[PDB]
Structures are given as C-alpha cells and as structure tokens.
Design a protein around this ligand. Structure first.
Ligand SMILES: *[C@@H]1O[C@H](CO)[C@@H](O)[C@H](O)[C@H]1NC(C)=O
Ligand SMILES: *[C@@H]1O[C@H](CO)[C@@H](O)[C@H](O)[C@H]1NC(C)=O
Ligand SMILES: *[C@@H]1O[C@H](CO)[C@@H](O)[C@H](O)[C@H]1NC(C)=O
Lengths: 277, 597
C-alpha cells in the first residue's frame, strides 16, 4: 500500500488503531512521520500469534518465508494488533491459509498467492496424487482457540526511502518569519544568510523566486504563506580609527564606515554621519 | 527430494491438517462434555470418525514410505505412530464386531443400574449412590447387597461380551504381530533401536514383579493394620488372620483405599489433616481454588494460564438443563486450546484434583511445541505422574501453611505427621497390589495362562493372594467382576497408574533434590522454589520425541523403574506400622472367606 502527500504522525495513528506490537525494525519506530516515504509498501495480513513474530526481519519462518518474506534489506515496521474476534469463529475461520512448506524462500518484495500442492520431490503433480502435498493449510482461528493460534492482524511497512516520488513526508514545524534581522533563512529548501523584510514586488503567480540585475535574489515567496520576502545582504563595514598624534595623547575614536549607529555592538557618545556611525 | 525429505513433507502436512481435524474432533467432544445432548453426541462421532479414518487413510500412505530407512529418531517415531493402524486392521466382520462389542460394553456398564429386591422401583446407577454408601455406610447388608447387585445386573451382561472381547482383541493383537493384548499393553513403552535407552516388553513384567516384591511387606503391614481397624469398625465380621471383604474398602473393587480414613484413623484426638472444613470456613468457590492452584504453579516456576482456559472451560456443576458429565479430565486440543472438565466442589480432594488437572494441562502446554502426534507424553504413565506430583506436593503441611488455611502456627509433632503419612499410604499402597493383580490377571487371560472358564476363580484367588481381599459371596462363571470395572470395559490399561505411583516418588525426590529440602520426603514441598520448576520442565515438554529412558535419566538420574523412593517415604510409617500391629497378625489367609464359614 502506497500513501501520498501526508504526515503519518504517530499520535493520530494511536487513536484510530492501537498496536499491541508497534516496532519499526529498519527505521525509527516513533517517528513514522519524520521518515520521507516513497513507494511505501504497507503490507496488511492476518497471522496466528506464533506467526506474528515469525514475519519480521532478522527472523526467518516458514510462514514468513513462503507467504510474506522479510529479509534484512528493507527498512520497515511491524505493527500487530489483536483481532481475534473478527478473524476467528467458534466454527473456525478457514479463510486464511499458510504456506507451511515450500521449495524456497520468497525474494524481497515478492508475492505468491498460488494454491498448488507442494512437491516434496520437486516436481509438481496433480492435487489428487499422493506424492504432492498441499502447502496452504487452513488457519486454526477460533474464538475458543488459545494464544498459540489466536488471530492477530499485522501490517509490515517495508519501504525504499526516496526510490520513487516522495509521498509520505512529514512537514517540519516552521519558524515562519523574522523581521529586519541578519539571520539564516530557509525558503522551503532555499537556505541563505541575510536581512529579511516584507516584499513589495508583484511576482508573477507562476514564479516564486526572484533575481536582480546584480543577479542576486531580491525577493522570494514564503512557502507556508504565499507572501513575498525581500532579502538584502548583511551589513559589512571597515572600522577606521581616528586619533590625534600618539605624542599628543592616547585617546582615539572609531568610525564604522557604512552602518548606522543601531547595529554597532557598542564609546559613551554616538553620532551618526553620512559616512557612518 | 530424498526419502527423508518427502517423509518430512508428508509428516508436516499431517501436522498442519491433523491439527485442525483433531481440534474439530475434540471440539465436538468438548461440546458433548459441557452439554450432554443427542445433537452433541452426533457432533462427537462425525469429526471423531473423520479423525480415525484420517489416521487410517494417511497410514495407507505412510506405510508406502518404508520405515527402516530413516537414520534419525525424531521423525522415525512419527512414521511409527502413523504406520500403526490402530484397531482397524482385521477381517471386515471381526474388526467391526469387536468395535460394536466394546461400544456395547461402554453403553451397558455406564448406564446400568441395580434395583431393590423387595421394591422394583428403587433403582440407581453406579456413580453416585453406590460408591457413597460403600465408602461411609456401617451396614454390612447394604454394602454387601450393593456390591453383589452391581456385579449381578451388568457383570452378567458383560461376561459373554468379555468372552468375545478377549478372543477378538487377541486376534487383533496377533494381526499386529504381538503376543497378546497384554503384549499390546507392554508395547506402550516400546522404544527400539537406541542401544542403551531401549526397553523390551517382557521387561515390563520383570520390573513390575521385581519392584512389587518390595511393596509386598509394606502392603502386608498396611493390610494387617486396616484389618485391625476393620475389626474396630466392623466387629464380628472378618477373621483376625484372614483377608478383607470386598465391600469394606471404600470403593467398588478395592482400588482406592482413601475412604477408610474415618474408620482407620490412627489418632483421632489430634487436629485433622483434611482441610475441607477450613475451605468451607472461608466460603471459597471453584474459581478461588483454581486461581490458588495457578498461583502455586507460578510459585514453583510454571507459567500462568491462557485466556482460552478461563474463557472456554467449564468449572462448576451446571445442574440445569445443560446437564453434563463431571469427571475430571484434561483435554489436549491443539491451537493453544488446552481445557479441563471438573465440576468442582469445596473439598480438599477437589483441591488436589484441581492441582492434578492443572499439572496435566501445564504438561500439555509445555509439550505443545512438539509435532502433533508427538504432542503427548513420552509414555502413558508420565502424564498421570506429573499430574499427581502437584497433588502430592500440595498435600504436605508445608503447602497448607502457605495456602492461608490452617493458621500458620502448626505444630510439628509426630502424631499428625504419622496421621498424614497413613492417610496418604492407604491410597498409595493399596492401589499397588490391585494394579498388580489386575494387570497380571488380564495379561495372562490374554496370554492364555487361565482357561477361559477359570477367569473368576483365579481373579478372586489372586485378590486374596496379592491384595488380601475376599469376595463375601461365591461367584460362578456367570458373572464378570473385572469387566464390571471402568478401565476393563472402556479400553484402558491399568499399569499406567503403577508407573504414576513409582515415578511420583521418583519425581518427588528429584524435585526435592534441588529445592534445598531439609526433612524426610513426607514434609517436602516444591513451593516457592523455581529450580524444581525447570528440573521438571526439562521433562515437561520433550513428548514422544525422546524415550522415557533418556527423560528419566535426566530427571532422577536412574535407568530402571524403582520404588525405593516410596519405601524411604514410608519407612518411618513402616516402623510405625510394625510397632502398632504387634498385638495382631501381619499377613492374610487366602482360605478364609465370609462365604466359607
Ligand atoms: C496556511 O494555513 C493558515 C492556517 O489557516 C492560513 O492562515 C494561511 O493563510 C495558509 N497559507 C497558505 C499559503 O495556504
Ligand atoms: C612630542 O611632543 C613634544 C612637545 O611637543 C616634543 O618635545 C617631543 O619631541 C615630541 N616627540 C615626538 C616623538 O614627536
Ligand atoms: C539606520 O537607522 C536610521 C534610523 O532608524 C535610518 O534613518 C537609516 O536609514 C538606517 N541606515 C540605513 C543604511 O538605512
């Protein structure tokens, strides 16, 4: 199962469904939202209680190997929850069958829905034949059944991260704005340093990133809120010392040649000149 | 690909299909057991017959696999189990004839009843009614009449059926290349081809005789003491040097001797060991008894019980329209479904029976990981022995003091100690000669050491000789008293109880070895220490994958059947018996009889 353009936060996951088993083998378990999923494979199935641990990377089981193989290569999550009532009946739900025995383990991300008798000699024969023995045996799923074969519903999310268009990719929390400050900025993956102000430039709606005759970025649309931000480079001046003759005295004064008396770190008195502060 | 690979393939398909099939069979059985109704029994013979026919039809395929090709022992025993045809390999007429005669036995013996001689309206069956009076009544005539009538009304109806039964069962045994049905029983412990962990069939008789030779003096002293106490309770009825009447032993056939305690109490002026009154005092129900049993299981190291047991099983007597049998039975069903049937009252005997069946189901849960037809005891006696271990350990005062009854200031004088030893010894000892005589008598009936018109004379003569019990009235060839017993007419061997009894004290000593036991074997409790837990668990799960010999040498470190643990358990009580009976005669005379004088 592939999901698209959403968050997959664990908090909302918990309310809808509660997992008795909630563990990501290949990735972080809690941050199901952080991970940026592309062509994710959310694999839903029903297995008996002992088969729940069998279908897991690092542990190879005949039910796992010949029905839904989990080698270490994928990164994924096992999510099991108790569904005994729905998947079992006092008469017995024979809907589910397990391939208890098969010639070879499934390839990674390989499916087999075949119901054809297993050949012990390796040559398939007709089901009525004595030599061929069916691999798919019906699940023992009863309301009266004990934990040994009690039904449980397990989904394993196996995914190749960014092996396709990224689709389940949690949007991070946004430090949306800052005003009149030399800081770093990230316009939706556009990172730089400068002073930020509101922008009175009517960008064409289709284009979002600006540029200048100086070839630098005047302004660009805020992704979170489609409002434009003006960018200017941070202030840089050359400190120049004024002094009388060192013979005359030792006192000095400093000139900051292109900045107003605001941004100077700061000397008792300040005086702003057309030159600088 | 190879022979063993395809054998494993077939056996694993057999596991994965027989799981559901026998689970359906046991579901129908359980529906019959929790609800006795014609629809339930009609469900019972559908899946049960489907299971028997499944075994036969897949044996027709397993027999195609040769047996003498697998070097391994794990799957070779599975092939042996599937290749055993069971009871369906005979001539077409005679196999079904023996089956329907056995079914007729199971019907008539179980539903039979006896009627008042002067009133053909007062008619009652065996259980209850007859066993309760012959366990507590002081009337000679009442007990004698019940004892005679139960063997008269249905024993006659079972005698010709038993006459056909011995012949047809021996023919079935011969068709399966056995000596007799006694050899079939001796073939239950039949492991082969191990060269050191092996066990023959006649060696069963050898061991039983050799380990009962040590019981004979202890049982002789106990028989002398119980004859003296029967003098005390039933004066002017028995010879001081003779044997015992068959209706004064608490039960129908003299099997269980616990009921004699009210009339064989050594020192009645001392506090009682029976805690049924204490259990009534706290107004306990079945649920509290079973939960306390499970807590004691946790204390020794065995796990809690699953949701299915407390969600499915029947624990109290219904009484209402949904009437059902109430015999204590553990039920292995697979699929994590391990159940128990007991209609439990507030009784100390019921407490120990609850522990007994809890131990059986704990054993079943431990070996649940075994293959489906190896999901059973390594032999027949180990299941019962493990079940009785918990009853024996729980019966000690060291466990009652921790239960909550019997306020924890309990004295440790020799008076109540000897009382408890004798109370346990009645059952433990007096069940052994009866087991010996019944098993040997049936073995030689099936073998042919008794002419078919000599069954009863020899049966009662060895009740006199081995058990020291005399029939109060003469019996002709018309009756059949052994067939008037549950295990003879319902296809159950009896030596499994002897193995239970001996392995019971063997496992007692084994579980006290690691439990830092300080006193003699009688005060030993396996509670609160988990080392006995894994020491019994390295038994509790092997199943029929390994023989009982390897398992027994891992448990107690012994190779052969031994009763010396029982002798050392009862040795202080043996000295007490020798001291007490100095004014009486130790032994019994087979010539005396209530009808011979
Ligand atoms: C984003 O959502 C907020 C919350 O309502 C809203 O105020 C803002 O205008 C939205 N911006 C865009 C670009 O959709
Ligand atoms: C510093 O000034 C004083 C007085 O004007 C003079 O005497 C001296 O030579 C001067 N020294 C230097 C290094 O200019
Ligand atoms: C410095 O601040 C003053 C007062 O806010 C302002 O008039 C001046 O334009 C600022 N400097 C520059 C370079 O804009």
């Amino acid at each position: 199962k592939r999901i698209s353009n959403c968050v997959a936060d664990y908090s909302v996951l918990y309310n809808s469904t509660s997992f008795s088993t909630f563990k990501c083998y290949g990735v972080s378990a809690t941050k199901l939202n952080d991970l940026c999923f592309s062509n994710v494979y959310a694999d839903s199935f029903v297995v008996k209680g002992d088969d729940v641990r069998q279908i897991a990377p690092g542990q190879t089981g005949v039910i796992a190997d010949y029905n839904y193989k989990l080698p270490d290569d994928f990164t994924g999550c096992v999510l099991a929850w108790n569904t005994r009532n729905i998947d079992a009946t006092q008469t017995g739900n024979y809907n589910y069958k397990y391939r208890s025995l098969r010639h070879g383990k499934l390839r990674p991300f390989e499916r087999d829905i075949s119901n054809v008798p297993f050949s012990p000699d390796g040559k398939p024969c007709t089901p009525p034949a004595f030599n061929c023995y069916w691999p798919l045996n019906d699940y023992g799923f009863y309301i009266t059944n004990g934990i040994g074969y009690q039904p449980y519903r397990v989904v394993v999310l196996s995914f190749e991260l960014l092996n396709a268009p990224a689709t389940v990719c949690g949007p991070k929390l946004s430090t949306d704005l800052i005003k009149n400050q030399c800081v770093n900025f990230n316009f939706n993956g556009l990172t730089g340093t400068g002073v930020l102000t509101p922008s009175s430039k009517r960008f064409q709606p289709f284009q979002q990133f600006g540029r200048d005759v100086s070839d630098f970025t005047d302004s660009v649309r805020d992704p979170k809120t489609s409002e434009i931000l003006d960018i200017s480079p941070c202030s840089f001046g050359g400190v120049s010392v004024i002094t009388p003759g060192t013979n005359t005295s030792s006192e000095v004064a400093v000139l900051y040649q292109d900045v107003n008396c605001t941004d100077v770190p700061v000397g008792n008195n300040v005086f702003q000149t057309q030159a600088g502060c | 690909s190879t022979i063993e690979e395809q054998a494993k393939t077939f056996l694993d398909k057999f596991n994965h299909e027989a799981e559901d099939l026998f689970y359906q069979s046991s579901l129908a059985s359980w529906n019959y057991n929790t609800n006795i109704t014609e629809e339930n029994v009609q469900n019972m013979n559908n899946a049960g017959d489907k299971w028997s026919a499944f075994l036969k039809e897949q044996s027709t395929l397993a027999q195609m696999y040769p047996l003498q090709e697998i070097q391994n022992l794990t799957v070779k025993l599975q092939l042996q189990a599937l290749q055993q045809n069971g009871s369906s390999v005979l001539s077409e007429d005679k196999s079904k004839r023996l089956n329907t005669i056995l079914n007729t036995m199971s019907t008539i013996y179980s539903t039979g009843k006896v009627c008042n001689p002067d009133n053909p309206q007062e008619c009652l069956l065996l259980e209850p009614g007859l066993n309760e009076i012959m366990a507590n009544s002081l009337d000679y005539n009442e007990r004698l009449w019940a004892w005679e009538s139960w063997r008269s009304e249905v024993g006659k109806q079972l005698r010709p059926l038993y006459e056909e039964y011995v012949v047809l069962k021996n023919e079935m045994a011969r068709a399966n290349h056995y000596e007799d049905y006694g050899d079939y029983w001796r073939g239950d412990y039949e492991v082969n081809g191990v060269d050191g962990y092996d066990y023959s069939r006649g060696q069963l008789i050898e061991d039983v005789e050799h380990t009962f030779e040590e019981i004979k003096p202890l049982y002789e002293h106990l028989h002398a003491y119980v004859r003296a106490k029967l003098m005390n309770a039933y004066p002017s009825y028995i010879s001081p040097i003779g044997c015992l009447p068959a209706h004064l032993l608490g039960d129908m056939w003299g099997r269980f001797w616990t009921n004699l305690y009210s009339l064989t109490v050594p020192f009645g002026q001392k506090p009682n060991i029976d805690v049924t009154d204490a259990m009534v005092d706290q107004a306990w129900d079945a649920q509290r008894i079973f939960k306390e049993a499970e807590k004691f299981f946790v204390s020794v190291g065995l796990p809690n019980m699953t949701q299915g047991f407390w969600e499915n099983s029947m624990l109290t007597d219904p009484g209402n329209v949904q009437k059902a049998v109430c015999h204590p039975t553990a039920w292995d069903l697979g699929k994590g479904d391990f159940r128990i049937l007991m209609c439990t009252k507030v009784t100390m005997d019921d407490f120990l029976t609850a522990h007994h069946e809890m131990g059986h189901i704990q054993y079943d849960m431990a070996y649940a990981a075994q293959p489906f037809l190896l999901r059973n005891g390594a032999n027949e006696g180990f299941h019962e022995a493990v079940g009785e271990i918990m009853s024996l350990s729980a019966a000690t005062p060291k466990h009652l003091k921790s239960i909550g009854l019997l306020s924890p200031d309990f004295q440790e004088d020799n008076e109540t100690e000897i009382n408890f030893l004798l109370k346990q010894a009645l059952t433990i000892v007096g069940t052994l000669p009866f087991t010996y005589m019944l098993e040997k008598w049936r073995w030689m009936v099936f073998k042919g050491e008794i002419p078919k018109d000599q069954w009863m004379k020899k049966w009662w003569e060895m009740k006199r000789e081995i058990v020291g019990v005399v029939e109060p009235v003469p019996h002709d060839e018309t009756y059949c008293d052994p067939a008037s017993l549950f295990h003879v007419s319902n296809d159950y061997s009896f030596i499994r109880y002897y193995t239970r009894t001996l392995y019971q004290f063997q496992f007692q000593e084994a579980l006290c070895q690691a439990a830092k036991h300080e006193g003699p074997l009688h005060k030993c409790d396996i509670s609160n220490s988990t080392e006995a837990g894994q020491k019994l668990f390295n038994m509790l799960r092997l199943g029929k994958s390994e023989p009982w010999t390897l398992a027994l040498e891992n448990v107690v470190g012994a190779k052969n059947m031994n009763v010396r643990p029982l002798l050392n358990y009862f040795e202080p009580l043996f000295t007490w018996l020798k001291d007490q009976n100095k004014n009486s005669f130790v032994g019994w005379s087979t010539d005396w009889s209530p009808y011979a004088d």
